[PDB]
Amino acid sequence: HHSIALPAHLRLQPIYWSRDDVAQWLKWAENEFSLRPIDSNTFEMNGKALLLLTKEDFRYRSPHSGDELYELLQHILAQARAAFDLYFVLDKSGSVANNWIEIYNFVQQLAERFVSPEMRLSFIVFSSQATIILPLTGDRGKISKGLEDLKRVSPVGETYIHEGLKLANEQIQKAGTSSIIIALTDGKLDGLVPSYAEKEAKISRSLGASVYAVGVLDFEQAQLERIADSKEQVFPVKGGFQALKGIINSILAQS
Numbered sequence: 348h349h350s351i352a353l354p355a356h357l358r359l360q361p362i363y364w365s366r367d368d369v370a371q372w373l374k375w376a377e378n379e380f381s382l383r384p385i386d387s388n389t390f391e392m393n394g395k396a397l398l399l400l401t402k403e404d405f406r407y408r409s410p411h412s413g414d415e416l417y418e419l420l421q422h423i424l425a426q427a428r429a430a431f432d433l434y435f436v437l438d439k440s441g442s443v444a445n446n447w448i449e450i451y452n453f454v455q456q457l458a459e460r461f462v463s464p465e466m467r468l469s470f471i472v473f474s475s476q477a478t479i480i481l482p483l484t485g486d487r488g489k490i491s492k493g494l495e496d497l498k499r500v501s502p503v504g505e506t507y508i509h510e511g512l513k514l515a516n517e518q519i520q521k522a523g524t525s526s527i528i529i530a531l532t533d534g535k536l537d538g539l540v541p542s543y544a545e546k547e548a549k550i551s552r553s554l555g556a557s558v559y560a561v562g563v564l565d566f567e568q569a570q571l572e573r574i575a576d577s578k579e580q581v582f583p584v585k586g587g588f589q590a591l592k593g594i595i596n597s598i599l600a601q602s
Contacts, residue, residue: 351422360427361420362463363599364394376419382412398424429466430524431598432483433457434556436511437497438532438563439472444502446563449584450531453561453591455494457529460595462487469518470497473511474504483518506536508574509543512551519554525602526556529594531584533563534570541570548574557601559594 357364357372364372369392373385389408390397397420405413435454443450458468470481470493480500481493508530519526528551536544548558559580560571571581580597582590 349426351419351426353423353426357423358427359599360429360463361394361398361423363595364397366391366393369394369397373416376416377412380412380415380419382415385409385412429463429602431461431466431602432469432519432522432524432526433461433466433598434469434471434483434515434518434526434528436471436473436508436515436528436530436532438506438508438511438530439474439500439502439504440506440532441474441503442506442535443533443563446584447500447502449563451494451497451500453531453584454497454529456591457595458490458494460591468493469515470494471511471514472497472500473506473508473514474502475507476504477507477510477514479514479518483522506532507540508532508536509540509547512544512547516547516550516554516556519551519556523555526554527598527601528556528558529561530558530574531561531563532571533565534560534567534574536570541573544570545573552576557598559598561590561594 354375357375369390370387373387373389376382377385402414402417405417409416437450437454467483467485468490469483472478472480480496481489515528551558558575560575561582561584562571563584568581572578575581582594
């Protein structure tokens, strides 16, 4: 449903709004609802901070329209739906043993940035065999415990990424919402695993999933390009916040 005809730029979940986005929301709300002038500094904060405020905080900051803006923000929350199922397919090979912390801190940060409702996460580790650490769940308690298990992972073995994608595809097929696959690896595949993994990524796209690849160490951009949907969905783990921001904005723009 869409009882409120929200503009496209404000259709993003408010938890991802920036300070400027909050300001644009005030300008839109002021005209759409014939409200009195609203200073653009009534809420000098991002959407994530705005969601922690109380209706009393709205009444104080905006005596003329604070109550209306709060109820407007609540109706927006009840319409802006994520519905993203994120599948982390993490390389726990011996080759990436010294960089597992990178893989972990990258997954941990995205899980915190992806804490919006209707967004469920899943953790899959692969080496010589594949294992599901965290099944697809929106429960933050299970997500928190899964991150604890990812920290205790002892990297060792080969790089059979097709085994990890199969675990993602099966879940995606069983549960069906945009399914997203975030594969963190160096793309160093031995034997026919390159063909196996690219064949398994076609099945993911056949299942309606979007395959992202985050490379670690001296990764093979080529191998990651073929697995991912395109070169634009291949990001470096060393990119830091930029890459984190890029992947999330790209994932959010999928829906």
